[PDB]
Amino acid sequence: RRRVLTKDGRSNVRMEHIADKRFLYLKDLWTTFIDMQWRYKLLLFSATFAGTWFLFGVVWYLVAVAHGDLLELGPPANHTPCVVQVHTLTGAFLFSLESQTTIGYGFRYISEECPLAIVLLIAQLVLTTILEIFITGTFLAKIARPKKRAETIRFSQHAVVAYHNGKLCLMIRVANMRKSLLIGCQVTGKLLQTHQTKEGENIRLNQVNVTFQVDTASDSPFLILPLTFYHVVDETSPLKDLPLRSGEGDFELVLILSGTVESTSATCQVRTSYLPEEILWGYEFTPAISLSASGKYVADFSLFDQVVKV
Amino acid sequence: RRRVLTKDGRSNVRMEHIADKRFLYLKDLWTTFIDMQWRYKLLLFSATFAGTWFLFGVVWYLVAVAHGDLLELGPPANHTPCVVQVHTLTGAFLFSLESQTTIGYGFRYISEECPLAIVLLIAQLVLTTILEIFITGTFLAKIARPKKRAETIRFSQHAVVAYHNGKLCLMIRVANMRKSLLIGCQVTGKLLQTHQTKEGENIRLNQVNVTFQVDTASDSPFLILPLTFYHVVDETSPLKDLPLRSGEGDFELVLILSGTVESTSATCQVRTSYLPEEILWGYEFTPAISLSASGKYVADFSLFDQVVKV
Amino acid sequence: RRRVLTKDGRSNVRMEHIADKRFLYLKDLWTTFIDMQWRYKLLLFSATFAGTWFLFGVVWYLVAVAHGDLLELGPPANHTPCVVQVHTLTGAFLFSLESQTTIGYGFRYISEECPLAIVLLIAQLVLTTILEIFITGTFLAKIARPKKRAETIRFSQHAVVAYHNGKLCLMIRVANMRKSLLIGCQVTGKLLQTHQTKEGENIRLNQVNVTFQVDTASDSPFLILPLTFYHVVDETSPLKDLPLRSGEGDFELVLILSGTVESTSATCQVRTSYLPEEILWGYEFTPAISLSASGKYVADFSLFDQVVKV
Amino acid sequence: RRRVLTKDGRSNVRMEHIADKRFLYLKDLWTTFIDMQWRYKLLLFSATFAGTWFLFGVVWYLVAVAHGDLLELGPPANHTPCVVQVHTLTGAFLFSLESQTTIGYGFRYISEECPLAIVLLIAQLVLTTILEIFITGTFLAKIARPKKRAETIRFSQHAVVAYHNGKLCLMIRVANMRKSLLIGCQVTGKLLQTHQTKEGENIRLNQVNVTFQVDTASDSPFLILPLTFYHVVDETSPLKDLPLRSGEGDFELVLILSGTVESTSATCQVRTSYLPEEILWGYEFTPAISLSASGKYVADFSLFDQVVKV
């Protein structure tokens, strides 16, 4: 079916007919590189490096020509070249490489003769320094992003409705597949249904907050163990008189979990959704925590998504 | 007209007669570079590099002189120089460059003869290492800033007043021109009018909070689609008995949207304003979202700022 | 005994039977390196470097062979090698090293003859650049983590119950063993007891918030001096009719302190716990702050954990 | 007088008799370097670099000896050294330098003869790479800290009491000496008085929150202009029946301003204090904002701290 958020939590919209997109991306380069695909990113990385090399190699070759350093121009024995041992565009590129990387073997070096050569080298160096810096920074950040981290936190596949403490509650389960901690986490659902007009031309989406509680309905400092989040279905509930039955109803229960990560201080956001068909009536998550002889608690994720009837 | 915040959200104040500004900027160098103009920043970048080069080149030339390494001083065949192949200030600069960048060709190298040369090189290296680090860090950060990001979020051009759910509401529209998400966003307006005294000498600006609501008047986790923010004009409203009519009134409705960015964990703040003349009476934003055959929602920004009369 | 959080605040759970763990770690490499053990991390660091070296050395040796550059292949005096001075896998590795580190002595350099050599070098450079960057970034971050910082903040060893301002209060003490400040700190306890079912197969842990107050029960901006945190044991208390006596009761009072660090803007979280046996009845922390002639306050941590009876 | 926080906002406590301080600092190296003095930090920076150089130079000299590479050991014309052109501890150090920095001139290079030399070089490289990284990271961060930034935000020198809107209010003034913005700022005062016991042995400090309001008593998104913060002295006030008169009373009004910075996403905290003597009765900050012909507001900091009587 059509849905707001993919079951794993990826965006499910496209945008169209943005005027002046290109210029706007050119202004905000940094973000544009951080958000770009990986293929084109690798390509741009390698191209930056080797293409700066190549361009400056052609440039150095031209400087050589204009000064006649080439061999079969028949330079006199008097002739000090603008650069040493450069008489082919190949060696030109090779010197571009040796100097810009700063490998600097020493079989080709600059000579005191040509000043334009000197300034040209300084320019090459400064610019390529800049570009190296920029690209490496974007690459660092694009790895560092915590989206990918989100995958090691998992919602239940199914939401289930039953009597908890005598109150009708819709229940979901969350867990963390790593030892590193999430902190300051908070669960907040939104409820999103369908409003059709005159036409299939437009839709107004009416959001409704749904809050989810654990103990005091506040937040949970640490997501130590698979946490059971439940929401009160009483007349305060925007869900109350939904068609509570099997399958029918035109809605989506978007679920959001936002909280800080321990080792990076980044805010990390997991998302997923529940369809009217995905919700189950009168069911009980098999408790997924058991204790062991060595003395502390075990989270066995074979039962995480298991349910049985009440 | 005079305004608090430029329509795009840039500061519109100047400060004057700050005593001891210069020293204060010299203390806080880091921020001072991060906040400085780009031109002077590039200039300072290149100058740092090449001027360290130049200074140490002069220094090396002097060391050469004091040791008589120059050629037409007629050094005996006995003579080991403080440095090899340095007999001109040109080569001096060239060695400064080759060592400080660590290009190190090898046609000019240090010799074991002069110890002062050695310490001098170590100093050059350590200091220039420091400066390189500092400047590159400031450059990284100054790119990374999220102000520029703010431009890819856009407020409506016009605020419009009408009956929403039967309540008189002032309405604005927001949207995001990129696929990357904003999170934890919150809209808060302030109301700023004009208080004149005895003189044109001074003014007290009285702020008044105005809150803006969407569904529950709480916040919206994600800015997926162009969001309609509305404020209740009832007697709780600081706007209530403003001259609600066309144009007149001496005020500014400053609008602020603050929230975390997904890919960087940075807090991002958009701002703009509304003048008494910019506000429109009895108008309806054409709904800007439509659905498509492939199945999910389209945000067509040609209608974003479009209105028609109710 | 079995406990939730180790007395110092380390996690005390294991997870089991995670399906598809390996692929999931391969997706999220960055975090996986940041969270990995130090031994394997050093190993992987050094291996990256020297093994890239070694692989490309073998590669260069092969290029040499295919071009017959080896000596006892008896290369004619006509013969320009793909690389200079490479006729042994040893020198191959040595050139890999000299170029990839960019040490570039110059006794072995590339020649204009073989283009495949050139592209091969460019590839070596680009890839090894990438890997260097990644590993150094993960290493930086893994140092930077503030967990280790947490150890310089210390809870009391014992929680003690007595009449503070006439109200029965459970009391703990916190302190900071460094001059650097913590800011925005907030103390929040959870109460965790034991719910057994039919079987030793599963357990539901019921959390209950416990709030801890100092002056106004709000938060404390700065943790200047050893702070006494106390909780009101009245009928609002989830502790109220616990077996308040010596030792008995099946619970754990988990204590959490979350707040921003000054010099890094990182959020820092200390944790520890209290067992039913660790709690003491009718006791008074000896006040740990005294003033001195030079004029300001001294925090003497010999008394920090000292108590005497009321 | 004795005070909690220095008028500018520096900590005014010392800690004493911390057991196991040294080991604890050795665990948390990163923070320990970030928090250490600048002198010792520069010293440690330069020492790391040049001392790694020096140690490995001695090491290389020893390898030379053990292989007899020294000249006046009279090496036969047959003799391939472990290293080229190294026959003095001086050149040893020079090669340490040329390789570890990767300056690599080429007058001294390694030869294929000695494998131990090779591994030794690889080790030198890897370790020194590590250390370089660590130190540069700590240096970056230690600059980046926003404490120093705090100095460009200034509280009033004097707190003043008077009738604002008819309510008795204690009033202070804040301002920002830079164009860069602070965001999400919040002012919160604490009130700290003196509780003496039996002895001059100990003191319990009782904190009391004091909230400070501007318009709605909420927070102020941006600190555009010098902001007047006022607190309501009515019977809700912990200040209410203080000795409201000149000078007397044994207290300190600690003032805290916490908020995010624009260009770095760092949280920035300004602090200062007010003594019972520093507070003034019946006084009015001269309004410090005036408008100008060019059209927008001017903050003239000559009047910032000026007052006159009501």
PDB file of N, CA, C and O in Angstrom, chain B residues 12-14 16-17 25 28 31-32 35 95 99 104-106 108-109 112 133 147 190 201-203 207 209 266-267 269, chain D residues 45-46 53 88 102-105 107 136 176 178 183 215-216 225 260 262-263 265 287 289-290 295-300:
ATOM      1  N   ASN B  12      19.647  42.892  11.386  1.00  0.00           N
ATOM      2  CA  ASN B  12      19.466  44.248  10.897  1.00  0.00           C
ATOM      3  C   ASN B  12      19.784  45.255  11.996  1.00  0.00           C
ATOM      4  O   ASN B  12      18.995  46.174  12.239  1.00  0.00           O
ATOM      5  N   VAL B  13      20.900  45.074  12.688  1.00  0.00           N
ATOM      6  CA  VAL B  13      21.389  46.016  13.682  1.00  0.00           C
ATOM      7  C   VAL B  13      22.855  46.268  13.397  1.00  0.00           C
ATOM      8  O   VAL B  13      23.523  45.445  12.761  1.00  0.00           O
ATOM      9  N   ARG B  14      23.356  47.395  13.873  1.00  0.00           N
ATOM     10  CA  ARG B  14      24.782  47.625  13.986  1.00  0.00           C
ATOM     11  C   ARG B  14      25.083  47.989  15.423  1.00  0.00           C
ATOM     12  O   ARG B  14      24.218  48.506  16.134  1.00  0.00           O
ATOM     13  N   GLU B  16      27.900  50.016  18.004  1.00  0.00           N
ATOM     14  CA  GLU B  16      28.784  51.159  17.922  1.00  0.00           C
ATOM     15  C   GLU B  16      29.411  51.464  19.274  1.00  0.00           C
ATOM     16  O   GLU B  16      28.827  51.217  20.330  1.00  0.00           O
ATOM     17  N   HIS B  17      30.622  52.006  19.214  1.00  0.00           N
ATOM     18  CA  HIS B  17      31.313  52.516  20.390  1.00  0.00           C
ATOM     19  C   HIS B  17      31.559  51.417  21.413  1.00  0.00           C
ATOM     20  O   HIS B  17      31.423  51.616  22.619  1.00  0.00           O
ATOM     21  N   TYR B  25      38.996  40.745  20.442  1.00  0.00           N
ATOM     22  CA  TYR B  25      39.049  39.853  19.293  1.00  0.00           C
ATOM     23  C   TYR B  25      40.344  39.064  19.285  1.00  0.00           C
ATOM     24  O   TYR B  25      40.380  37.919  18.823  1.00  0.00           O
ATOM     25  N   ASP B  28      39.908  35.963  21.629  1.00  0.00           N
ATOM     26  CA  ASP B  28      39.090  34.952  20.982  1.00  0.00           C
ATOM     27  C   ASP B  28      39.409  34.928  19.493  1.00  0.00           C
ATOM     28  O   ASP B  28      38.640  35.395  18.651  1.00  0.00           O
ATOM     29  N   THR B  31      36.965  32.125  17.107  1.00  0.00           N
ATOM     30  CA  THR B  31      35.698  32.663  16.658  1.00  0.00           C
ATOM     31  C   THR B  31      35.909  33.813  15.696  1.00  0.00           C
ATOM     32  O   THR B  31      35.115  34.023  14.776  1.00  0.00           O
ATOM     33  N   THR B  32      36.973  34.575  15.898  1.00  0.00           N
ATOM     34  CA  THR B  32      37.178  35.763  15.088  1.00  0.00           C
ATOM     35  C   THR B  32      37.480  35.381  13.657  1.00  0.00           C
ATOM     36  O   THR B  32      37.113  36.086  12.717  1.00  0.00           O
ATOM     37  N   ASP B  35      34.248  33.949  12.043  1.00  0.00           N
ATOM     38  CA  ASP B  35      33.226  34.936  11.725  1.00  0.00           C
ATOM     39  C   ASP B  35      33.695  35.975  10.719  1.00  0.00           C
ATOM     40  O   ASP B  35      32.915  36.863  10.359  1.00  0.00           O
ATOM     41  N   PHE B  95      64.028  26.245  -0.497  1.00  0.00           N
ATOM     42  CA  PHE B  95      64.258  25.212   0.503  1.00  0.00           C
ATOM     43  C   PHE B  95      63.269  25.354   1.642  1.00  0.00           C
ATOM     44  O   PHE B  95      62.771  24.358   2.187  1.00  0.00           O
ATOM     45  N   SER B  99      60.861  22.118   2.486  1.00  0.00           N
ATOM     46  CA  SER B  99      60.931  21.464   3.783  1.00  0.00           C
ATOM     47  C   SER B  99      59.665  21.687   4.583  1.00  0.00           C
ATOM     48  O   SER B  99      59.218  20.801   5.319  1.00  0.00           O
ATOM     49  N   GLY B 104      60.389  18.142  -0.152  1.00  0.00           N
ATOM     50  CA  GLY B 104      61.689  17.501  -0.039  1.00  0.00           C
ATOM     51  C   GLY B 104      62.209  16.796  -1.274  1.00  0.00           C
ATOM     52  O   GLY B 104      62.369  15.573  -1.275  1.00  0.00           O
ATOM     53  N   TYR B 105      62.493  17.554  -2.329  1.00  0.00           N
ATOM     54  CA  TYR B 105      63.062  16.959  -3.528  1.00  0.00           C
ATOM     55  C   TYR B 105      64.374  16.254  -3.220  1.00  0.00           C
ATOM     56  O   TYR B 105      64.476  15.031  -3.360  1.00  0.00           O
ATOM     57  N   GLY B 106      65.389  17.006  -2.789  1.00  0.00           N
ATOM     58  CA  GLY B 106      66.662  16.457  -2.381  1.00  0.00           C
ATOM     59  C   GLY B 106      67.856  17.089  -3.044  1.00  0.00           C
ATOM     60  O   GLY B 106      68.986  16.657  -2.794  1.00  0.00           O
ATOM     61  N   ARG B 108      68.523  20.226  -2.561  1.00  0.00           N
ATOM     62  CA  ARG B 108      68.971  21.025  -1.439  1.00  0.00           C
ATOM     63  C   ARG B 108      68.578  20.274  -0.181  1.00  0.00           C
ATOM     64  O   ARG B 108      67.398  19.986   0.028  1.00  0.00           O
ATOM     65  N   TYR B 109      69.565  19.929   0.629  1.00  0.00           N
ATOM     66  CA  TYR B 109      69.307  19.299   1.911  1.00  0.00           C
ATOM     67  C   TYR B 109      70.216  19.926   2.953  1.00  0.00           C
ATOM     68  O   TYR B 109      71.115  20.706   2.632  1.00  0.00           O
ATOM     69  N   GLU B 112      75.298  18.079   8.174  1.00  0.00           N
ATOM     70  CA  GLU B 112      75.585  17.884   9.586  1.00  0.00           C
ATOM     71  C   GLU B 112      76.445  18.986  10.183  1.00  0.00           C
ATOM     72  O   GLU B 112      76.743  18.931  11.380  1.00  0.00           O
ATOM     73  N   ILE B 133      47.561  23.859  11.132  1.00  0.00           N
ATOM     74  CA  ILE B 133      46.454  23.220  11.824  1.00  0.00           C
ATOM     75  C   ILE B 133      45.356  24.226  12.110  1.00  0.00           C
ATOM     76  O   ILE B 133      44.183  24.008  11.782  1.00  0.00           O
ATOM     77  N   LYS B 147      24.102  28.150   8.843  1.00  0.00           N
ATOM     78  CA  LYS B 147      23.397  29.301   8.297  1.00  0.00           C
ATOM     79  C   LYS B 147      23.066  29.094   6.831  1.00  0.00           C
ATOM     80  O   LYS B 147      21.895  29.131   6.440  1.00  0.00           O
ATOM     81  N   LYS B 190       7.795  36.259  17.650  1.00  0.00           N
ATOM     82  CA  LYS B 190       7.756  37.351  18.598  1.00  0.00           C
ATOM     83  C   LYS B 190       7.089  38.523  17.904  1.00  0.00           C
ATOM     84  O   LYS B 190       7.086  38.625  16.674  1.00  0.00           O
ATOM     85  N   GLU B 201      15.966  59.705  20.760  1.00  0.00           N
ATOM     86  CA  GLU B 201      17.254  59.326  21.313  1.00  0.00           C
ATOM     87  C   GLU B 201      17.326  57.855  21.647  1.00  0.00           C
ATOM     88  O   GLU B 201      18.424  57.305  21.708  1.00  0.00           O
ATOM     89  N   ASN B 202      16.195  57.231  21.939  1.00  0.00           N
ATOM     90  CA  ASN B 202      16.202  55.880  22.466  1.00  0.00           C
ATOM     91  C   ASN B 202      14.857  55.240  22.200  1.00  0.00           C
ATOM     92  O   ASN B 202      13.880  55.938  21.912  1.00  0.00           O
ATOM     93  N   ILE B 203      14.811  53.915  22.290  1.00  0.00           N
ATOM     94  CA  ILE B 203      13.583  53.158  22.101  1.00  0.00           C
ATOM     95  C   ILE B 203      13.645  51.918  22.971  1.00  0.00           C
ATOM     96  O   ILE B 203      14.675  51.233  23.023  1.00  0.00           O
ATOM     97  N   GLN B 207       8.936  42.939  23.602  1.00  0.00           N
ATOM     98  CA  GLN B 207       8.702  41.674  22.925  1.00  0.00           C
ATOM     99  C   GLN B 207       7.400  41.104  23.462  1.00  0.00           C
ATOM    100  O   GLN B 207       7.042  41.360  24.616  1.00  0.00           O
ATOM    101  N   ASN B 209       5.718  37.107  23.108  1.00  0.00           N
ATOM    102  CA  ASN B 209       5.674  35.804  22.475  1.00  0.00           C
ATOM    103  C   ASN B 209       4.370  35.632  21.720  1.00  0.00           C
ATOM    104  O   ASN B 209       3.312  36.084  22.164  1.00  0.00           O
ATOM    105  N   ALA B 266      23.625  19.541  14.015  1.00  0.00           N
ATOM    106  CA  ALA B 266      23.675  20.963  14.283  1.00  0.00           C
ATOM    107  C   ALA B 266      22.278  21.526  14.450  1.00  0.00           C
ATOM    108  O   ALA B 266      21.323  21.054  13.829  1.00  0.00           O
ATOM    109  N   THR B 267      22.159  22.531  15.305  1.00  0.00           N
ATOM    110  CA  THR B 267      20.914  23.273  15.401  1.00  0.00           C
ATOM    111  C   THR B 267      20.883  24.359  14.340  1.00  0.00           C
ATOM    112  O   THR B 267      21.843  25.115  14.172  1.00  0.00           O
ATOM    113  N   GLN B 269      18.555  27.450  12.426  1.00  0.00           N
ATOM    114  CA  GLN B 269      17.580  28.476  12.762  1.00  0.00           C
ATOM    115  C   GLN B 269      17.273  29.295  11.518  1.00  0.00           C
ATOM    116  O   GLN B 269      18.152  29.958  10.963  1.00  0.00           O
TER     117      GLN B 269
ATOM    118  N   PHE D  45      53.864  19.205  23.007  1.00  0.00           N
ATOM    119  CA  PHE D  45      53.756  19.151  21.555  1.00  0.00           C
ATOM    120  C   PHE D  45      55.136  19.039  20.917  1.00  0.00           C
ATOM    121  O   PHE D  45      55.476  18.042  20.249  1.00  0.00           O
ATOM    122  N   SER D  46      55.956  20.058  21.156  1.00  0.00           N
ATOM    123  CA  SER D  46      57.297  20.091  20.592  1.00  0.00           C
ATOM    124  C   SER D  46      58.120  18.904  21.057  1.00  0.00           C
ATOM    125  O   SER D  46      58.905  18.341  20.284  1.00  0.00           O
ATOM    126  N   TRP D  53      61.923  12.117  17.254  1.00  0.00           N
ATOM    127  CA  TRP D  53      63.064  12.261  16.362  1.00  0.00           C
ATOM    128  C   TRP D  53      64.352  11.811  17.034  1.00  0.00           C
ATOM    129  O   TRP D  53      65.075  10.962  16.509  1.00  0.00           O
ATOM    130  N   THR D  88      77.356   9.161  11.566  1.00  0.00           N
ATOM    131  CA  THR D  88      77.406   9.985  12.753  1.00  0.00           C
ATOM    132  C   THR D  88      76.017  10.068  13.350  1.00  0.00           C
ATOM    133  O   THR D  88      75.009  10.086  12.641  1.00  0.00           O
ATOM    134  N   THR D 102      58.660  12.993   6.887  1.00  0.00           N
ATOM    135  CA  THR D 102      58.495  12.696   5.482  1.00  0.00           C
ATOM    136  C   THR D 102      58.954  13.881   4.638  1.00  0.00           C
ATOM    137  O   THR D 102      58.331  14.238   3.638  1.00  0.00           O
ATOM    138  N   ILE D 103      60.056  14.507   5.056  1.00  0.00           N
ATOM    139  CA  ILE D 103      60.728  15.479   4.198  1.00  0.00           C
ATOM    140  C   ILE D 103      61.531  14.757   3.122  1.00  0.00           C
ATOM    141  O   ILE D 103      61.556  15.178   1.963  1.00  0.00           O
ATOM    142  N   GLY D 104      62.195  13.659   3.485  1.00  0.00           N
ATOM    143  CA  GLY D 104      62.834  12.780   2.520  1.00  0.00           C
ATOM    144  C   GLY D 104      63.627  13.445   1.415  1.00  0.00           C
ATOM    145  O   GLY D 104      63.267  13.347   0.240  1.00  0.00           O
ATOM    146  N   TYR D 105      64.721  14.114   1.773  1.00  0.00           N
ATOM    147  CA  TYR D 105      65.572  14.721   0.764  1.00  0.00           C
ATOM    148  C   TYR D 105      66.086  13.679  -0.219  1.00  0.00           C
ATOM    149  O   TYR D 105      65.760  13.727  -1.409  1.00  0.00           O
ATOM    150  N   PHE D 107      69.567  12.242   0.301  1.00  0.00           N
ATOM    151  CA  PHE D 107      70.999  12.063   0.480  1.00  0.00           C
ATOM    152  C   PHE D 107      71.282  10.948   1.467  1.00  0.00           C
ATOM    153  O   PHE D 107      72.376  10.378   1.488  1.00  0.00           O
ATOM    154  N   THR D 136      47.565  16.689  17.699  1.00  0.00           N
ATOM    155  CA  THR D 136      46.918  17.695  16.877  1.00  0.00           C
ATOM    156  C   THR D 136      45.437  17.768  17.189  1.00  0.00           C
ATOM    157  O   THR D 136      44.842  18.851  17.179  1.00  0.00           O
ATOM    158  N   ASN D 176      25.917  41.324  24.000  1.00  0.00           N
ATOM    159  CA  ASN D 176      26.831  40.535  23.184  1.00  0.00           C
ATOM    160  C   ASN D 176      27.729  41.485  22.409  1.00  0.00           C
ATOM    161  O   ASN D 176      27.234  42.336  21.664  1.00  0.00           O
ATOM    162  N   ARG D 178      29.628  40.924  19.864  1.00  0.00           N
ATOM    163  CA  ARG D 178      29.979  40.421  18.545  1.00  0.00           C
ATOM    164  C   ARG D 178      28.741  40.258  17.674  1.00  0.00           C
ATOM    165  O   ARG D 178      27.610  40.195  18.157  1.00  0.00           O
ATOM    166  N   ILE D 183      22.007  31.620  20.581  1.00  0.00           N
ATOM    167  CA  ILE D 183      20.657  31.146  20.325  1.00  0.00           C
ATOM    168  C   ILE D 183      20.223  30.188  21.425  1.00  0.00           C
ATOM    169  O   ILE D 183      21.052  29.491  22.021  1.00  0.00           O
ATOM    170  N   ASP D 215       9.911  38.986  28.686  1.00  0.00           N
ATOM    171  CA  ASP D 215       8.585  39.281  28.156  1.00  0.00           C
ATOM    172  C   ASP D 215       7.538  38.348  28.734  1.00  0.00           C
ATOM    173  O   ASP D 215       6.576  38.798  29.363  1.00  0.00           O
ATOM    174  N   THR D 216       7.724  37.050  28.545  1.00  0.00           N
ATOM    175  CA  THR D 216       6.801  36.026  28.988  1.00  0.00           C
ATOM    176  C   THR D 216       7.448  35.116  30.011  1.00  0.00           C
ATOM    177  O   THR D 216       6.812  34.168  30.476  1.00  0.00           O
ATOM    178  N   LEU D 225      20.073  42.439  21.026  1.00  0.00           N
ATOM    179  CA  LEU D 225      20.410  43.727  21.601  1.00  0.00           C
ATOM    180  C   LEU D 225      20.523  43.572  23.103  1.00  0.00           C
ATOM    181  O   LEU D 225      20.042  42.579  23.664  1.00  0.00           O
ATOM    182  N   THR D 260      23.087  27.927  22.925  1.00  0.00           N
ATOM    183  CA  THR D 260      23.843  27.411  21.794  1.00  0.00           C
ATOM    184  C   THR D 260      24.474  28.549  20.990  1.00  0.00           C
ATOM    185  O   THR D 260      23.900  29.639  20.899  1.00  0.00           O
ATOM    186  N   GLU D 262      25.922  29.953  17.227  1.00  0.00           N
ATOM    187  CA  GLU D 262      25.411  29.814  15.869  1.00  0.00           C
ATOM    188  C   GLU D 262      26.377  29.047  14.984  1.00  0.00           C
ATOM    189  O   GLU D 262      25.997  28.088  14.306  1.00  0.00           O
ATOM    190  N   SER D 263      27.640  29.455  14.985  1.00  0.00           N
ATOM    191  CA  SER D 263      28.581  28.983  13.988  1.00  0.00           C
ATOM    192  C   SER D 263      29.246  27.666  14.354  1.00  0.00           C
ATOM    193  O   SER D 263      30.037  27.153  13.559  1.00  0.00           O
ATOM    194  N   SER D 265      27.480  25.225  16.931  1.00  0.00           N
ATOM    195  CA  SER D 265      26.537  24.317  17.578  1.00  0.00           C
ATOM    196  C   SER D 265      26.983  23.939  18.979  1.00  0.00           C
ATOM    197  O   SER D 265      26.486  22.972  19.555  1.00  0.00           O
ATOM    198  N   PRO D 287      18.573  53.603  29.048  1.00  0.00           N
ATOM    199  CA  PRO D 287      18.353  52.748  27.877  1.00  0.00           C
ATOM    200  C   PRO D 287      19.508  52.915  26.905  1.00  0.00           C
ATOM    201  O   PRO D 287      19.944  54.030  26.616  1.00  0.00           O
ATOM    202  N   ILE D 289      19.860  51.614  23.679  1.00  0.00           N
ATOM    203  CA  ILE D 289      19.590  51.416  22.260  1.00  0.00           C
ATOM    204  C   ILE D 289      19.018  52.699  21.698  1.00  0.00           C
ATOM    205  O   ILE D 289      18.106  53.285  22.286  1.00  0.00           O
ATOM    206  N   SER D 290      19.544  53.123  20.556  1.00  0.00           N
ATOM    207  CA  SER D 290      19.036  54.278  19.840  1.00  0.00           C
ATOM    208  C   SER D 290      19.020  53.969  18.357  1.00  0.00           C
ATOM    209  O   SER D 290      19.772  53.119  17.870  1.00  0.00           O
ATOM    210  N   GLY D 295      18.751  53.660   9.443  1.00  0.00           N
ATOM    211  CA  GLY D 295      17.429  53.112   9.650  1.00  0.00           C
ATOM    212  C   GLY D 295      17.263  52.029  10.693  1.00  0.00           C
ATOM    213  O   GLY D 295      16.119  51.699  11.020  1.00  0.00           O
ATOM    214  N   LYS D 296      18.340  51.462  11.238  1.00  0.00           N
ATOM    215  CA  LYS D 296      18.216  50.330  12.154  1.00  0.00           C
ATOM    216  C   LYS D 296      18.993  50.606  13.434  1.00  0.00           C
ATOM    217  O   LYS D 296      19.679  51.627  13.539  1.00  0.00           O
ATOM    218  N   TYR D 297      18.909  49.681  14.384  1.00  0.00           N
ATOM    219  CA  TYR D 297      19.143  50.026  15.778  1.00  0.00           C
ATOM    220  C   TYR D 297      20.619  49.933  16.134  1.00  0.00           C
ATOM    221  O   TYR D 297      21.358  49.104  15.599  1.00  0.00           O
ATOM    222  N   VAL D 298      21.044  50.810  17.037  1.00  0.00           N
ATOM    223  CA  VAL D 298      22.438  50.922  17.446  1.00  0.00           C
ATOM    224  C   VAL D 298      22.522  50.599  18.924  1.00  0.00           C
ATOM    225  O   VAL D 298      21.728  51.109  19.723  1.00  0.00           O
ATOM    226  N   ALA D 299      23.478  49.754  19.283  1.00  0.00           N
ATOM    227  CA  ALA D 299      23.729  49.400  20.671  1.00  0.00           C
ATOM    228  C   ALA D 299      25.021  50.070  21.128  1.00  0.00           C
ATOM    229  O   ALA D 299      26.118  49.587  20.829  1.00  0.00           O
ATOM    230  N   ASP D 300      24.894  51.173  21.867  1.00  0.00           N
ATOM    231  CA  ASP D 300      26.036  51.988  22.271  1.00  0.00           C
ATOM    232  C   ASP D 300      26.448  51.590  23.683  1.00  0.00           C
ATOM    233  O   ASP D 300      25.787  51.954  24.660  1.00  0.00           O
TER     234      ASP D 300
END
